[PDB]
Amino acid sequence: VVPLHTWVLISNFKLSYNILRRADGTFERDLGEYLDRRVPANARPLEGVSSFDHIIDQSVGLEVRIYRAALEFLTDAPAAEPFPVIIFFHGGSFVHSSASSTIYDSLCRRFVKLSKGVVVSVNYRRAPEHRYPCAYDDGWTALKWVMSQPFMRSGGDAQARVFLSGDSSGGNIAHHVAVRAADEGVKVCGNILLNAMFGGTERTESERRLDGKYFVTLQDRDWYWKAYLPEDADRDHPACNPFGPNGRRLGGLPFAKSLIIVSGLDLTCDRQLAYADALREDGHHVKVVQCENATVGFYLLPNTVHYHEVMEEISDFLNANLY
């Protein structure tokens, strides 16, 4: 059973998003922006956390929201003691939501309380207007920006202790940014993936079994992939299916340790677990948290055991991977 408040909240998204996707693959963008629930940044702490909006790349208008316990502070000296910086990529299937979306503002606030660190939430460019690889470009831009701020740095070796994190499409983005980091010898302390979004041309058992049962449909999954991938591409494109027929194994790369959180009632759970399996197979460290009773979005409402469990696993993983 889905708790009633989760059911109501996620259904509200499901039904609204139904009217925004057009049959021709275009999107009701102005209406989507108008209907999204969002909050401003606020320098004044709410429950001990403050937030600040900042453009980090003027060429593409790329903005982030920075959260910390409580503008000029970015200049501040590297902290004596280590702290995590979590670079967060919101969900919404490459198409929806924003760093200002209340569900994500609230999650980032909770991440700061939980990590005693800093959260940088990236307003990546969205599909269908901006297709592959724009969102990945923006996450790489954000990683490099974070690494270069004195404030973000900490510990003996005064460096940014960066974790890449995201749910849904943002978890996909986190992965691809992490791969690029490993290719370029940029150190990432860990990836935190919540229901990371992956796909492929064939359906898995979970996809066929859970289709339409828990807010998500294959029609809509196919729609979002079509919206993000190049016009001539299919779901076996490596952005979508990083270890499928057109994929690339990651053996030998200095790849991040991964905490991989999977909802058992997310119809794509099979792919997330096979993703984890492939990382392990490539010699990388993976911790998988399977939340068998959880639907998509469970980490958004503090109303299930899985919610509490996962916040604790996140805290443990951060602590374990900081020093």
Ligand X SMILES: C=C1C[C@]23C[C@H]1CC[C@H]2[C@@]12CC[C@H](O)[C@@](C)(C(=O)O1)[C@H]2[C@@H]3C(=O)O
* In the block, residue with structure tokens 């194994």: 249
Determine, following the binding rule CB under 6 A, whether residue 321 of this chain makes contact with ligand X: no
d(CA 154, CA 81) in angstroms, rounded, equals 6
Nearest Cα residue to 221 out of 167, 281, 266, 265: 266
Q: Which long-range contacts (CB under 8 A, 24 or more apart) does 159-162 make?
A: 159/78, 159/187, 160/85, 161/82, 161/83, 161/84, 161/85, 161/117, 161/189, 161/322, 162/84, 162/85, 162/86, 162/87, 162/187, 162/188, 162/189
Nearest Cα residue to 85 out of 31, 145, 26: 145
Using the rule CB under 6 A, give the single segment among 7-15, 107-115, 118-126, 182-190 that binds ligand X: 7-15
Write down the least CB distance from residue 292 to ligand X, Å: 17
Q: Is 208 exposed, middle or buried (0-12, 13-18, 19+ CB in 10 A)?
A: exposed
> Contacting ligand X (CB under 6 A), which of 50, 98, 115, 168?
168
Using the rule CB under 6 A, give the single segment among 39-47, 65-73, 91-99, 145-153 that binds ligand X: 91-99
> Contacting ligand X (CB under 6 A), which of 3, 7, 14, 288?
14
Write down the least CB distance from residue 246 to ligand X, Å: 23
Residues 15 to 34: which contact ligand X by CB under 6 A? Answer: 17
> Contacting ligand X (CB under 6 A), which of 6, 13, 182, 314?
13
> Contacting ligand X (CB under 6 A), which of 2, 6, 10, 207?
10
Give residues with Cβ within 8 angstroms of 301, minimum separation 6.
3, 5, 6, 9, 307
154 known ligand binder = no
What angle (nearest 5°) sits at the alpha carbon of residue 253, between those of residues 250 and 254? 135
Determine, following the binding rule CB under 6 A, whether residue 296 of this chain makes contact with ligand X: yes
> Contacting ligand X (CB under 6 A), which of 56, 68, 86, 92?
92
Nearer to ligand X, 96 or 257 (CB): 96
Give backbone dihedrals phi and psi of 287, rounded to 5 degrees, phi first.
Answer: -115, 120
Catalytic residue chosen out of the listed positions 97, 154, 165, 168: 168
Give the bridge partners for 161, in sequence order: 84
Which residue is at the shortest CB distance from ligand X?
297
Residues 42 to 81: which contact ligand X by CB under 6 A? Answer: none
Residues 210 to 249: which contact ligand X by CB under 6 A? Answer: 215-216, 220
Write down the least CB distance from residue 251 to ligand X, Å: 30
Nearer to ligand X, 281 or 309 (CB): 309
Write down the least CB distance from residue 149 to ligand X, Å: 28
Nearer to ligand X, 28 or 220 (CB): 220
Active site residue 168: yes
Determine, following the binding rule CB under 6 A, whether residue 36 of this chain makes contact with ligand X: no
Nearer to ligand X, 17 or 136 (CB): 17
Give residues with Cβ within 8 angstroms of 77, minimum separation 6.
150
> Contacting ligand X (CB under 6 A), which of 120, 297, 321, 322?
297
50 known ligand binder = no
What is the chain's Cα-based Rg?
18
Catalytic residues: 168, 266
Task: Point out which residues bind ligand X (CB under 6 A).
Answer: 10, 13-14, 17, 91-93, 96-97, 103, 167-168, 215-216, 220, 296-297
Annotated binding site for gibberellin A4: 92-93, 104, 168, 297
Annotated binding site: 92-93, 104, 168, 220, 297
